[PDB]
């Protein structure tokens, strides 16, 4: 039932329930002359919701908020962006206008400002060194080291054993690298090793784009990154 790129018109947002109190959000966007899906996460936080990542653009993110109200009916009170690119922060202004408290690490906020992307309001402390983890409501935020970007965070939901990798983890159907312009290709395998060592109990793994899977997505991503490094 997990929605794919061909089953989501650009501008629409679909939700998928992964576990009790954990959903992914799926949207699509035109980029480089193709259409790509993108995932984020929604995690129940008592009687509120924590959002992980925008829906890749202002229009998509407004649709995301509407779909959350229609399907779930709890308020989104906080959001975390897992790196500085537009598929993670594009729509932060919509969230802020809607009363959501937006968060990112200091490194993400700075990179967003340099790039000209939207800047989350609040800073997340305790994530400046590889291997750092902090609890943030019902999730753990982990900085594995540089990978897809130098600032990329991953998110673990302890109660549901859900690991959200963002753009640092590839879906299985992606067998060649994605956007690596800002990547640290040399460190990416080591950063994945840190994720594996820190979250070996994860049951569901959600990539930044495409279908969820298990922990096999981690080794798959290393294989693809290494192949790109050698090409
Ligand atoms: C637009 C910006 O958010 C991008 C980024 O975050 O790098 C999106 N993410 C990826 C990815 O590889 O994760 C993309 C891959 C297709 C282009 C090659 S588009
Ligand atoms: Cl705020
Ligand atoms: Cl606040
Ligand atoms: Mg930082
Ligand atoms: Na970008
Ligand atoms: Zn990115
Ligand atoms: Zn605030
Ligand atoms: Zn991406």
UniProtKB/TrEMBL annotation:
NCBIfam families: bla_class_B_core (NF012229), bla_subclass_B1 (NF033088), blaVIM (NF012100). Keywords: Antibiotic resistance, Hydrolase, Metal-binding, Periplasm, Plasmid, Signal, Zinc. Its EC number is 3.5.2.6. It catalyses: a beta-lactam + H2O = a substituted beta-amino acid. It comes from Pseudomonas aeruginosa. Its cofactor is Zn(2+). Monomer. One of its GO terms (molecular function) is beta-lactamase activity. Zn(2+) 1 binds at residue 47. It is found in: Periplasm. Residues 37-209 form the Metallo-beta-lactamase domain. This is beta-lactamase. Zn(2+) 4 binds at residues 87, 167, 209. Mg(2+) 3 binds at residue 138. GO terms for biological process: antibiotic catabolic process; response to antibiotic. The gene is blaVIM-2. Zn(2+) 6 binds at residue 220. InterPro entries: BlaB//VIM/IMP-1 (IPR058199), Metallo-B-lactamas (IPR001279), NDM-1-like (IPR050855), RibonucZ/Hydroxyglut_hydro (IPR036866), VIM-1/2/7 (IPR058044), VIM-1/2_MBL (IPR049721). Belongs to the metallo-beta-lactamase superfamily. Class-B beta-lactamase family. Mg(2+) 4 binds at residue 171. Zn(2+) 3 binds at residues 87, 167. Mg(2+) 2 binds at residue 12.
